[PDB]
């Protein structure tokens, strides 16, 4: 029989991750691109900051120490305009306490994750080693048209 593998989805899309555990640095002012709309395969836009820049981030609080192995991301098609948006690359920030934040590194420099080439398909990125964290931040670095984000995290809880 199949043994357990640390690579299960942690709650986005599912629901195990509550609306209250998702937040952002900001959000688009019209209210139609909130952080709660960044769940993978959501059909109501996604998350968009108030200003498109590489200082914005989407944040998820796992509420418990958790093994984190991979991140999946999509852009989003605007429900209102049929326009497509997506993040093309991002950095990852993690934290056990929500105040001391480490930018994920590969070697001496920040790992820059390559992300999406369209607004519909899922791009999965694995970490080169599972990381034990409670807070995760996705901070885009490049994007097509504008930042728009749907997300899933993979792992297991200790």
């Amino acid at each position: 029989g199949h043994m357990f593998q640390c690579n299960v989805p942690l709650g986005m899309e599912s629901g195990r991750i509550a609306n209250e555990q998702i937040s952002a640095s900001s959000t688009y002012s019209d209210g139609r691109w909130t952080p709660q709309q960044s769940r993978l395969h959501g059909d109501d836009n996604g998350w968009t900051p108030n200003l498109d820049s590489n200082k914005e981030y989407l944040q998820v609080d796992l509420r418990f120490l958790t093994m984190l192995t991979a991140i999946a991301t999509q852009g989003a098609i605007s429900r209102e305009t049929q326009n497509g948006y997506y993040v093309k690359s991002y950095k990852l920030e993690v934290s056990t306490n929500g105040e001391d934040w480490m930018v994920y590194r590969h070697g001496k420099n920040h790992k820059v994750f390559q992300a999406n080439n369209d607004a519909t398909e899922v791009v999965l990125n694995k970490l080169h080693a599972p990381l034990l964290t409670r807070f995760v931040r996705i901070r885009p670095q490049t994007w097509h048209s504008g930042i728009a984000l749907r997300l899933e995290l993979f792992g297991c809880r200790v």
Partner: peptide
């Protein structure tokens, strides 16, 4: 009338 995102 507000260009929509």
């Amino acid at each position: 009338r507000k260009l929509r995102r």
